[PDB]
Amino acid sequence: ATRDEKITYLRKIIGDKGSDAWDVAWQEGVTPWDQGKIQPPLRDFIESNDGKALVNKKSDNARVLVPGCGKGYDAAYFASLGYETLGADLSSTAIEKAKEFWAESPELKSGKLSFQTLDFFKFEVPEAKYDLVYDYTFFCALPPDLRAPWGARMRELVRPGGTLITLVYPIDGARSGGPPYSIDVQKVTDALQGGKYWTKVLDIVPQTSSPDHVGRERLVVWERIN
Ligand SMILES: Nc1ncnc2c1ncn2[C@@H]1O[C@H](C[C@@H](N)CC[C@H](N)C(=O)O)[C@@H](O)[C@H]1O
Ligand SMILES: Cc1cc(C)c(S(=O)(=O)O)c(C)c1
């Protein structure tokens, strides 16, 4: 019942079952990551002018992908802004949980918001790709040997000139624990760039962070270049 127990039990299935351990933890209720809401830094950036420039540039077909959406809080936020948003998670339970949590959302009924059980590493990239991708508590969930494929998949999922927002969390330092892995902007930079493929347009410390997130989180905005 203790959070530390739930993390220890979670890290035990990931060692025994691997990627299939995520749907196991979702249906078993062991979801110590679920905060019920989007992180404040995401809203403040979008409502800022540095973020406004992206929301006003938004075309009438701007597509947003939220890998590892969980219950799809961030995905529902981007749909509320007018984006054709897709929430993708490996767990079919989580996708079913997101569809209940946002059942009354006008965007789920209209189709702007969509929740699908997809594999970030396996699903077919749409031809038009994605104008924006948001990664929170997904890169830090992947084991270290999957970060390079993560950045490789991000290079093809984001269209040229598109945006990849990465809320780097948790920035805990030398903590060698499993999920959630301690990450920094450097680890995200190495995975994304294999000035090769991306441009770090913004790297900021969020003004309004969750209290447990203070000092362990940075919002980084990447642009896909040629
Ligand atoms: N290869 C994958 N493709 C898609 N989703 C994945 C993959 N591996 C793990 N996940 C999902 O990533 C999520 C990680 C969780 N910490 C959820 C974090 C989620 N972003 C939240 O804020 O609640 C789980 O829902 C997993 O099912
Ligand atoms: C994948 C994953 C797992 C856990 C347990 C947590 S945490 O909320 O407890 O820190 C986070 C943020 C991500």
Side-chain angles (χ1 to χ4, degrees):
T2 298
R3 159 225 186 223
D4 289 48
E5 297 173 328
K6 305 180 73 203
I7 309 201
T8 317
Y9 171 71
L10 177 68
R11 298 186 183 168
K12 216 158 65 53
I13 331 171
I14 313 276
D16 287 333
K17 290 272 225 144
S19 98
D20 319 84
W22 288 107
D23 196 49
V24 166
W26 266 105
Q27 66 183 57
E28 271 175 343
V30 201
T31 59
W33 54 81
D34 209 73
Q35 307 295 343
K37 26 166 190 143
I38 76 178
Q39 283 298 323
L42 174 60
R43 210 194 316 102
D44 285 48
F45 167 80
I46 285 301
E47 291 177 347
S48 88
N49 302 321
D50 315 352
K52 185 284 299 212
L54 272 38
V55 198
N56 285 29
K57 156 209 67 53
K58 167 208 126 53
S59 77
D60 270 317
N61 256 263
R63 292 153 65 90
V64 162
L65 167 80
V66 183
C69 62
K71 258 197 255 154
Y73 311 123
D74 314 292
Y77 177 64
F78 284 118
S80 79
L81 308 166
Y83 295 85
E84 192 200 294
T85 301
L86 167 73
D89 203 277
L90 195 67
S91 160
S92 49
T93 308
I95 297 292
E96 176 57 49
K97 296 292 329 160
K99 279 194 263 230
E100 305 161 7
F101 195 97
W102 302 103
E104 4 190 38
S105 149
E107 301 90 23
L108 216 173
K109 203 215 172 233
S110 83
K112 272 267 154 90
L113 183 52
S114 191
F115 289 101
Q116 312 206 12
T117 306
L118 311 160
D119 200 315
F120 174 77
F121 296 109
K122 291 169 137 95
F123 80 98
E124 270 261 272
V125 165
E127 155 145 335
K129 290 140 125 60
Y130 288 104
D131 312 62
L132 200 141
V133 177
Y134 180 68
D135 186 287
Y136 173 65
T137 50
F138 183 47
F139 180 85
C140 79
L142 296 178
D145 49 82
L146 303 202
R147 304 183 171 145
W150 172 90
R153 281 286 288 179
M154 287 296 203
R155 278 172 235 133
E156 32 194 299
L157 274 154
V158 187
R159 61 154 185 101
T163 298
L164 165 76
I165 294 155
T166 49
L167 192 48
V168 185
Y169 172 84
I171 313 181
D172 289 343
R175 191 186 43 74
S176 343
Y181 293 89
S182 180
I183 60 172
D184 47 36
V185 182
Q186 188 75 260
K187 286 165 175 79
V188 185
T189 308
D190 295 342
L192 284 172
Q193 304 274 35
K196 276 139 214 69
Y197 313 93
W198 304 88
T199 285
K200 198 170 77 165
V201 195
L202 214 81
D203 188 352
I204 63 158
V205 172
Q207 276 311 137
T208 51
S209 283
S210 289
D212 41 341
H213 287 28
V214 169
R216 321 156 49 217
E217 150 186 271
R218 290 188 76 98
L219 188 125
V220 187
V221 177
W222 312 79
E223 179 171 336
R224 184 84 177 83
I225 57 100
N226 306 75

Short mmCIF file of all heavy atoms in Angstrom, two decimals, residues 105-161:
data_model
loop_
_atom_site.label_atom_id
_atom_site.label_comp_id
_atom_site.label_asym_id
_atom_site.label_seq_id
_atom_site.Cartn_x
_atom_site.Cartn_y
_atom_site.Cartn_z
N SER A 105 -15.97 14.24 -22.08
CA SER A 105 -15.24 15.28 -22.79
C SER A 105 -15.89 15.52 -24.15
O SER A 105 -16.17 14.55 -24.88
CB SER A 105 -13.78 14.88 -22.96
OG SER A 105 -13.25 15.41 -24.17
N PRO A 106 -16.15 16.77 -24.53
CA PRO A 106 -16.69 17.02 -25.87
C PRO A 106 -15.75 16.60 -26.99
O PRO A 106 -16.22 16.25 -28.08
CB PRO A 106 -16.92 18.54 -25.88
CG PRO A 106 -16.97 18.93 -24.43
CD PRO A 106 -16.02 18.00 -23.74
N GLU A 107 -14.44 16.61 -26.73
CA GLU A 107 -13.48 16.23 -27.76
C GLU A 107 -13.43 14.73 -27.99
O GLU A 107 -13.17 14.29 -29.11
CB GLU A 107 -12.09 16.75 -27.38
CG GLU A 107 -12.03 18.26 -27.20
CD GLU A 107 -12.32 18.70 -25.78
OE1 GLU A 107 -12.14 17.87 -24.86
OE2 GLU A 107 -12.73 19.86 -25.58
N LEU A 108 -13.69 13.92 -26.95
CA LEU A 108 -13.79 12.48 -27.17
C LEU A 108 -15.00 12.14 -28.02
O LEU A 108 -14.92 11.27 -28.90
CB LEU A 108 -13.84 11.74 -25.82
CG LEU A 108 -13.12 10.38 -25.73
CD1 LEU A 108 -13.10 9.85 -24.31
CD2 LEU A 108 -13.72 9.34 -26.67
N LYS A 109 -16.12 12.83 -27.80
CA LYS A 109 -17.30 12.60 -28.62
C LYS A 109 -17.10 13.14 -30.04
O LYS A 109 -17.47 12.48 -31.02
CB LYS A 109 -18.53 13.23 -27.97
CG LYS A 109 -19.85 12.62 -28.41
CD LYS A 109 -20.94 13.67 -28.49
CE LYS A 109 -22.20 13.10 -29.11
NZ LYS A 109 -22.68 13.93 -30.25
N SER A 110 -16.52 14.33 -30.16
CA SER A 110 -16.33 14.93 -31.48
C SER A 110 -15.28 14.18 -32.29
O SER A 110 -15.34 14.18 -33.53
CB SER A 110 -15.93 16.40 -31.33
OG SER A 110 -14.54 16.53 -31.09
N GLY A 111 -14.31 13.55 -31.63
CA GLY A 111 -13.23 12.87 -32.31
C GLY A 111 -11.90 13.60 -32.27
O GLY A 111 -10.89 13.03 -32.69
N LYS A 112 -11.88 14.85 -31.79
CA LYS A 112 -10.62 15.56 -31.63
C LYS A 112 -9.68 14.81 -30.70
O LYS A 112 -8.46 14.77 -30.94
CB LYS A 112 -10.89 16.97 -31.09
CG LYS A 112 -11.15 18.02 -32.17
CD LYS A 112 -9.87 18.73 -32.57
CE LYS A 112 -9.96 19.26 -33.99
NZ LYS A 112 -10.49 20.65 -34.03
N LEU A 113 -10.22 14.21 -29.65
CA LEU A 113 -9.45 13.39 -28.72
C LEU A 113 -9.67 11.92 -29.05
O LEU A 113 -10.80 11.49 -29.29
CB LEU A 113 -9.87 13.68 -27.28
CG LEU A 113 -9.11 12.95 -26.17
CD1 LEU A 113 -7.61 13.13 -26.33
CD2 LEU A 113 -9.57 13.44 -24.81
N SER A 114 -8.58 11.15 -29.05
CA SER A 114 -8.64 9.74 -29.40
C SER A 114 -7.66 8.97 -28.53
O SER A 114 -6.50 9.37 -28.39
CB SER A 114 -8.31 9.52 -30.89
OG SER A 114 -8.61 8.20 -31.28
N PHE A 115 -8.13 7.86 -27.96
CA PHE A 115 -7.31 6.99 -27.12
C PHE A 115 -7.22 5.62 -27.77
O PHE A 115 -8.24 4.98 -28.02
CB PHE A 115 -7.90 6.88 -25.71
CG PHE A 115 -7.77 8.12 -24.90
CD1 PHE A 115 -8.84 8.99 -24.74
CD2 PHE A 115 -6.56 8.44 -24.29
CE1 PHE A 115 -8.71 10.14 -23.99
CE2 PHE A 115 -6.43 9.59 -23.54
CZ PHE A 115 -7.51 10.44 -23.39
N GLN A 116 -6.00 5.19 -28.06
CA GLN A 116 -5.76 3.92 -28.73
C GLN A 116 -4.63 3.17 -28.05
O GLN A 116 -3.63 3.77 -27.66
CB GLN A 116 -5.42 4.12 -30.22
CG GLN A 116 -6.37 5.06 -30.95
CD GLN A 116 -6.42 4.79 -32.44
OE1 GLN A 116 -5.94 3.77 -32.91
NE2 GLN A 116 -7.01 5.72 -33.18
N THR A 117 -4.80 1.86 -27.91
CA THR A 117 -3.76 0.99 -27.36
C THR A 117 -2.73 0.75 -28.45
O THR A 117 -2.89 -0.13 -29.29
CB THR A 117 -4.35 -0.32 -26.85
OG1 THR A 117 -5.41 -0.04 -25.93
CG2 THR A 117 -3.28 -1.15 -26.16
N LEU A 118 -1.66 1.54 -28.43
CA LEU A 118 -0.60 1.44 -29.43
C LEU A 118 0.74 1.28 -28.75
O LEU A 118 0.93 1.67 -27.59
CB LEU A 118 -0.57 2.66 -30.35
CG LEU A 118 -1.90 3.11 -30.97
CD1 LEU A 118 -1.81 4.56 -31.43
CD2 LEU A 118 -2.29 2.20 -32.12
N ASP A 119 1.68 0.70 -29.49
CA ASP A 119 3.07 0.58 -29.05
C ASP A 119 3.87 1.70 -29.70
O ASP A 119 3.96 1.78 -30.93
CB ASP A 119 3.64 -0.78 -29.44
CG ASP A 119 4.85 -1.16 -28.62
OD1 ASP A 119 5.74 -0.30 -28.44
OD2 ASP A 119 4.92 -2.32 -28.17
N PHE A 120 4.44 2.58 -28.86
CA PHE A 120 5.20 3.72 -29.36
C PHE A 120 6.29 3.29 -30.33
O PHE A 120 6.59 4.01 -31.30
CB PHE A 120 5.81 4.49 -28.19
CG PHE A 120 6.73 5.60 -28.60
CD1 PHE A 120 6.22 6.80 -29.07
CD2 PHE A 120 8.11 5.46 -28.52
CE1 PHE A 120 7.05 7.83 -29.44
CE2 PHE A 120 8.95 6.48 -28.90
CZ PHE A 120 8.42 7.68 -29.36
N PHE A 121 6.90 2.13 -30.11
CA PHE A 121 7.98 1.64 -30.95
C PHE A 121 7.49 0.87 -32.17
O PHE A 121 8.29 0.59 -33.07
CB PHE A 121 8.91 0.73 -30.14
CG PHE A 121 9.62 1.44 -29.02
CD1 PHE A 121 9.28 1.20 -27.70
CD2 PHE A 121 10.64 2.35 -29.29
CE1 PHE A 121 9.94 1.84 -26.67
CE2 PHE A 121 11.29 3.00 -28.26
CZ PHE A 121 10.94 2.74 -26.95
N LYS A 122 6.20 0.53 -32.24
CA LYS A 122 5.72 -0.39 -33.26
C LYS A 122 4.65 0.18 -34.18
O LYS A 122 4.57 -0.24 -35.34
CB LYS A 122 5.17 -1.67 -32.61
CG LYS A 122 6.23 -2.55 -31.97
CD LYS A 122 5.60 -3.64 -31.12
CE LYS A 122 6.30 -4.97 -31.33
NZ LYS A 122 7.35 -5.22 -30.32
N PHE A 123 3.82 1.11 -33.71
CA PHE A 123 2.68 1.55 -34.52
C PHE A 123 3.15 2.34 -35.73
O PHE A 123 4.21 2.98 -35.73
CB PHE A 123 1.71 2.38 -33.67
CG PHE A 123 2.12 3.82 -33.48
CD1 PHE A 123 1.59 4.82 -34.28
CD2 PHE A 123 3.00 4.17 -32.47
CE1 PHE A 123 1.95 6.14 -34.09
CE2 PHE A 123 3.36 5.49 -32.28
CZ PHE A 123 2.84 6.47 -33.09
N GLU A 124 2.35 2.28 -36.79
CA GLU A 124 2.72 2.88 -38.07
C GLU A 124 2.61 4.40 -38.00
O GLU A 124 1.55 4.94 -37.66
CB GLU A 124 1.82 2.34 -39.19
CG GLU A 124 2.36 1.09 -39.86
CD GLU A 124 3.07 1.40 -41.17
OE1 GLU A 124 2.39 1.43 -42.22
OE2 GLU A 124 4.30 1.60 -41.15
N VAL A 125 3.71 5.07 -38.31
CA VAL A 125 3.71 6.54 -38.31
C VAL A 125 2.80 7.04 -39.42
O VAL A 125 2.95 6.62 -40.58
CB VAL A 125 5.14 7.06 -38.49
CG1 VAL A 125 5.11 8.54 -38.85
CG2 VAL A 125 5.95 6.83 -37.23
N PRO A 126 1.83 7.91 -39.12
CA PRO A 126 0.99 8.46 -40.19
C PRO A 126 1.82 9.23 -41.20
O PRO A 126 2.89 9.76 -40.89
CB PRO A 126 0.02 9.38 -39.44
CG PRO A 126 -0.01 8.83 -38.05
CD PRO A 126 1.39 8.34 -37.79
N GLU A 127 1.32 9.29 -42.44
CA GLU A 127 2.07 9.90 -43.53
C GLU A 127 2.36 11.37 -43.23
O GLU A 127 3.48 11.85 -43.42
CB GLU A 127 1.31 9.75 -44.84
CG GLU A 127 1.64 10.82 -45.88
CD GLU A 127 1.61 10.28 -47.29
OE1 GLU A 127 1.81 9.06 -47.47
OE2 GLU A 127 1.39 11.07 -48.23
N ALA A 128 1.35 12.11 -42.76
CA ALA A 128 1.53 13.51 -42.43
C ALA A 128 2.32 13.73 -41.15
O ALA A 128 2.61 14.88 -40.80
CB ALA A 128 0.17 14.21 -42.32
N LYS A 129 2.68 12.65 -40.44
CA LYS A 129 3.40 12.73 -39.17
C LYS A 129 2.63 13.56 -38.15
O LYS A 129 1.42 13.75 -38.29
CB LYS A 129 4.81 13.29 -39.39
CG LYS A 129 5.74 12.34 -40.13
CD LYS A 129 6.61 13.07 -41.14
CE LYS A 129 8.08 12.79 -40.90
NZ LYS A 129 8.40 11.34 -41.02
N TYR A 130 3.32 14.07 -37.13
CA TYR A 130 2.69 14.81 -36.05
C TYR A 130 3.32 16.18 -35.93
O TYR A 130 4.55 16.30 -35.90
CB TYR A 130 2.79 14.05 -34.73
CG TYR A 130 1.91 12.82 -34.67
CD1 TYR A 130 2.45 11.55 -34.81
CD2 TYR A 130 0.54 12.94 -34.49
CE1 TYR A 130 1.65 10.42 -34.77
CE2 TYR A 130 -0.27 11.82 -34.44
CZ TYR A 130 0.29 10.56 -34.58
OH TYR A 130 -0.51 9.45 -34.54
N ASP A 131 2.48 17.22 -35.85
CA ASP A 131 2.99 18.57 -35.69
C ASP A 131 3.55 18.80 -34.29
O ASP A 131 4.50 19.58 -34.12
CB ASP A 131 1.88 19.59 -35.99
CG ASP A 131 1.16 19.29 -37.28
OD1 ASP A 131 0.53 18.22 -37.38
OD2 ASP A 131 1.21 20.13 -38.20
N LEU A 132 2.98 18.15 -33.28
CA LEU A 132 3.43 18.31 -31.91
C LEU A 132 3.38 16.97 -31.19
O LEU A 132 2.46 16.18 -31.40
CB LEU A 132 2.58 19.34 -31.15
CG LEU A 132 3.21 19.94 -29.89
CD1 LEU A 132 2.90 21.43 -29.79
CD2 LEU A 132 2.74 19.21 -28.65
N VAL A 133 4.38 16.72 -30.35
CA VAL A 133 4.44 15.54 -29.50
C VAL A 133 4.82 15.98 -28.10
O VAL A 133 5.71 16.83 -27.92
CB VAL A 133 5.45 14.50 -30.04
CG1 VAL A 133 5.54 13.30 -29.10
CG2 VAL A 133 5.06 14.04 -31.43
N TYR A 134 4.14 15.42 -27.10
CA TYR A 134 4.39 15.75 -25.70
C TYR A 134 4.81 14.49 -24.96
O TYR A 134 4.08 13.50 -24.96
CB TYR A 134 3.14 16.36 -25.05
CG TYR A 134 3.32 16.73 -23.60
CD1 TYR A 134 4.15 17.77 -23.23
CD2 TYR A 134 2.66 16.03 -22.60
CE1 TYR A 134 4.33 18.11 -21.90
CE2 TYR A 134 2.83 16.36 -21.27
CZ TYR A 134 3.66 17.40 -20.92
OH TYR A 134 3.83 17.74 -19.60
N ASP A 135 5.99 14.54 -24.33
CA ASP A 135 6.53 13.41 -23.59
C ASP A 135 6.66 13.81 -22.12
O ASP A 135 7.51 14.63 -21.77
CB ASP A 135 7.88 12.98 -24.16
CG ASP A 135 8.41 11.71 -23.51
OD1 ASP A 135 8.84 11.77 -22.33
OD2 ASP A 135 8.39 10.65 -24.17
N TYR A 136 5.81 13.22 -21.28
CA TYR A 136 5.91 13.36 -19.84
C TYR A 136 5.75 11.99 -19.20
O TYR A 136 4.83 11.25 -19.55
CB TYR A 136 4.87 14.33 -19.28
CG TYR A 136 4.84 14.38 -17.76
CD1 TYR A 136 5.94 14.84 -17.05
CD2 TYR A 136 3.73 13.94 -17.06
CE1 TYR A 136 5.92 14.88 -15.67
CE2 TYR A 136 3.71 13.97 -15.67
CZ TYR A 136 4.81 14.44 -14.98
OH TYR A 136 4.79 14.48 -13.61
N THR A 137 6.63 11.67 -18.25
CA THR A 137 6.64 10.39 -17.56
C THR A 137 6.55 9.22 -18.53
O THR A 137 5.93 8.19 -18.25
CB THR A 137 5.53 10.31 -16.51
OG1 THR A 137 4.27 10.71 -17.08
CG2 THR A 137 5.85 11.21 -15.33
N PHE A 138 7.18 9.38 -19.70
CA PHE A 138 7.33 8.30 -20.66
C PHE A 138 8.80 7.99 -20.93
O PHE A 138 9.20 6.82 -20.89
CB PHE A 138 6.62 8.64 -21.98
CG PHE A 138 6.69 7.55 -23.00
CD1 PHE A 138 6.40 6.24 -22.66
CD2 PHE A 138 7.05 7.83 -24.31
CE1 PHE A 138 6.46 5.23 -23.60
CE2 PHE A 138 7.11 6.82 -25.26
CZ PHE A 138 6.82 5.52 -24.90
N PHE A 139 9.61 9.01 -21.22
CA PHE A 139 11.04 8.80 -21.37
C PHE A 139 11.66 8.29 -20.08
O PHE A 139 12.52 7.41 -20.10
CB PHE A 139 11.71 10.09 -21.83
CG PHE A 139 13.19 9.97 -22.03
CD1 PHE A 139 13.71 9.50 -23.22
CD2 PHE A 139 14.08 10.34 -21.02
CE1 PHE A 139 15.07 9.39 -23.41
CE2 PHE A 139 15.44 10.24 -21.21
CZ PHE A 139 15.94 9.76 -22.40
N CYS A 140 11.24 8.85 -18.94
CA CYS A 140 11.74 8.39 -17.65
C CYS A 140 11.18 7.03 -17.25
O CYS A 140 11.67 6.45 -16.27
CB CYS A 140 11.41 9.42 -16.56
SG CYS A 140 9.70 9.37 -15.98
N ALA A 141 10.19 6.52 -17.97
CA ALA A 141 9.67 5.18 -17.73
C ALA A 141 10.43 4.12 -18.51
O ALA A 141 10.50 2.97 -18.06
CB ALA A 141 8.19 5.11 -18.08
N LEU A 142 10.98 4.48 -19.66
CA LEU A 142 11.68 3.51 -20.49
C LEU A 142 13.00 3.11 -19.83
O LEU A 142 13.67 3.96 -19.24
CB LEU A 142 11.94 4.09 -21.88
CG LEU A 142 10.72 4.42 -22.74
CD1 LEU A 142 11.16 5.03 -24.06
CD2 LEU A 142 9.88 3.17 -22.97
N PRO A 143 13.39 1.85 -19.92
CA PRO A 143 14.72 1.45 -19.45
C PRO A 143 15.80 2.13 -20.26
O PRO A 143 15.55 2.57 -21.39
CB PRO A 143 14.73 -0.08 -19.65
CG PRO A 143 13.65 -0.34 -20.65
CD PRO A 143 12.60 0.70 -20.39
N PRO A 144 17.02 2.24 -19.72
CA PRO A 144 18.06 3.02 -20.41
C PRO A 144 18.39 2.52 -21.81
O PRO A 144 18.78 3.32 -22.66
CB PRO A 144 19.27 2.90 -19.47
CG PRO A 144 18.67 2.62 -18.13
CD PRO A 144 17.48 1.75 -18.41
N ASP A 145 18.25 1.22 -22.06
CA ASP A 145 18.57 0.67 -23.37
C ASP A 145 17.50 0.94 -24.42
O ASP A 145 17.67 0.53 -25.57
CB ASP A 145 18.83 -0.84 -23.26
CG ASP A 145 17.76 -1.57 -22.48
OD1 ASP A 145 16.71 -1.89 -23.06
OD2 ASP A 145 17.97 -1.82 -21.27
N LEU A 146 16.42 1.64 -24.07
CA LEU A 146 15.37 2.01 -25.01
C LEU A 146 15.32 3.51 -25.29
O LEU A 146 14.43 3.96 -26.01
CB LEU A 146 14.01 1.54 -24.50
CG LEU A 146 13.79 0.05 -24.20
CD1 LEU A 146 12.31 -0.27 -24.25
CD2 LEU A 146 14.54 -0.80 -25.21
N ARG A 147 16.27 4.28 -24.77
CA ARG A 147 16.24 5.73 -24.98
C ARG A 147 16.65 6.10 -26.40
O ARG A 147 16.09 7.04 -26.98
CB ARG A 147 17.13 6.42 -23.95
CG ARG A 147 16.77 6.10 -22.51
CD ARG A 147 17.63 6.86 -21.52
NE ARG A 147 17.14 6.71 -20.16
CZ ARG A 147 17.92 6.65 -19.09
NH1 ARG A 147 19.24 6.74 -19.18
NH2 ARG A 147 17.37 6.51 -17.89
N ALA A 148 17.62 5.38 -26.97
CA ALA A 148 18.07 5.64 -28.33
C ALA A 148 16.96 5.32 -29.34
O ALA A 148 16.71 6.12 -30.24
CB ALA A 148 19.34 4.85 -28.64
N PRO A 149 16.28 4.17 -29.23
CA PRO A 149 15.11 3.96 -30.09
C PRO A 149 14.00 4.96 -29.85
O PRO A 149 13.26 5.30 -30.78
CB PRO A 149 14.67 2.53 -29.74
CG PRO A 149 15.90 1.88 -29.22
CD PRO A 149 16.59 2.95 -28.46
N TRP A 150 13.87 5.46 -28.62
CA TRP A 150 12.89 6.50 -28.33
C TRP A 150 13.16 7.75 -29.15
O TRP A 150 12.27 8.28 -29.81
CB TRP A 150 12.89 6.81 -26.83
CG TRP A 150 12.06 7.99 -26.44
CD1 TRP A 150 10.74 7.99 -26.09
CD2 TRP A 150 12.50 9.36 -26.34
NE1 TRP A 150 10.33 9.26 -25.79
CE2 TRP A 150 11.39 10.12 -25.94
CE3 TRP A 150 13.72 10.00 -26.57
CZ2 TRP A 150 11.46 11.50 -25.75
CZ3 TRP A 150 13.79 11.37 -26.38
CH2 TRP A 150 12.66 12.10 -25.97
N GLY A 151 14.41 8.23 -29.12
CA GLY A 151 14.77 9.38 -29.93
C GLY A 151 14.71 9.11 -31.42
O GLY A 151 14.39 10.00 -32.20
N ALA A 152 15.03 7.88 -31.82
CA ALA A 152 14.92 7.52 -33.23
C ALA A 152 13.47 7.54 -33.70
O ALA A 152 13.18 8.00 -34.80
CB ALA A 152 15.55 6.14 -33.47
N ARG A 153 12.56 7.03 -32.87
CA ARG A 153 11.14 7.08 -33.21
C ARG A 153 10.60 8.51 -33.18
O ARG A 153 9.70 8.85 -33.96
CB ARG A 153 10.34 6.19 -32.27
CG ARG A 153 10.41 4.71 -32.61
CD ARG A 153 9.59 4.38 -33.84
NE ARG A 153 8.16 4.45 -33.58
CZ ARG A 153 7.22 4.23 -34.49
NH1 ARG A 153 7.53 3.93 -35.74
NH2 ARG A 153 5.94 4.31 -34.14
N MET A 154 11.13 9.35 -32.29
CA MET A 154 10.70 10.74 -32.23
C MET A 154 11.13 11.51 -33.47
O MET A 154 10.44 12.45 -33.88
CB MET A 154 11.24 11.41 -30.97
CG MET A 154 10.57 10.97 -29.69
SD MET A 154 8.82 11.40 -29.62
CE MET A 154 8.54 11.40 -27.85
N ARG A 155 12.25 11.13 -34.08
CA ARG A 155 12.74 11.84 -35.26
C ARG A 155 11.79 11.67 -36.44
O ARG A 155 11.67 12.58 -37.27
CB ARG A 155 14.14 11.35 -35.63
CG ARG A 155 15.26 12.00 -34.83
CD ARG A 155 16.59 11.33 -35.11
NE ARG A 155 17.24 10.88 -33.89
CZ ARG A 155 17.78 9.68 -33.72
NH1 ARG A 155 17.77 8.78 -34.69
NH2 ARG A 155 18.35 9.37 -32.56
N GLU A 156 11.13 10.52 -36.54
CA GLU A 156 10.22 10.25 -37.65
C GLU A 156 8.77 10.62 -37.33
O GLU A 156 8.00 10.89 -38.25
CB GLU A 156 10.28 8.77 -38.04
CG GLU A 156 10.58 7.84 -36.88
CD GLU A 156 10.98 6.45 -37.32
OE1 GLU A 156 10.16 5.78 -37.98
OE2 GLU A 156 12.11 6.03 -37.02
N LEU A 157 8.40 10.64 -36.05
CA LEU A 157 7.03 10.96 -35.68
C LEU A 157 6.74 12.45 -35.79
O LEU A 157 5.61 12.84 -36.12
CB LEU A 157 6.74 10.47 -34.26
CG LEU A 157 6.29 9.02 -34.18
CD1 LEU A 157 6.62 8.43 -32.82
CD2 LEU A 157 4.81 8.92 -34.47
N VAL A 158 7.73 13.29 -35.52
CA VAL A 158 7.56 14.74 -35.59
C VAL A 158 7.91 15.20 -36.99
O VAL A 158 9.01 14.94 -37.49
CB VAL A 158 8.43 15.45 -34.54
CG1 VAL A 158 8.11 16.93 -34.50
CG2 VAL A 158 8.22 14.82 -33.17
N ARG A 159 6.97 15.89 -37.64
CA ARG A 159 7.21 16.43 -38.97
C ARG A 159 8.31 17.50 -38.91
O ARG A 159 8.55 18.10 -37.86
CB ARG A 159 5.92 17.03 -39.53
CG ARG A 159 5.37 18.18 -38.71
CD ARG A 159 4.53 19.13 -39.55
NE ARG A 159 4.09 20.29 -38.79
CZ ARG A 159 4.65 21.49 -38.86
NH1 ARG A 159 5.68 21.73 -39.66
NH2 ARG A 159 4.17 22.48 -38.12
N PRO A 160 9.00 17.73 -40.02
CA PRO A 160 9.97 18.83 -40.07
C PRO A 160 9.30 20.16 -39.75
O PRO A 160 8.23 20.48 -40.27
CB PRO A 160 10.49 18.78 -41.51
CG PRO A 160 10.30 17.37 -41.92
CD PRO A 160 9.02 16.93 -41.26
N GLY A 161 9.94 20.94 -38.88
CA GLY A 161 9.33 22.14 -38.36
C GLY A 161 8.36 21.92 -37.23
O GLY A 161 7.86 22.90 -36.66
#
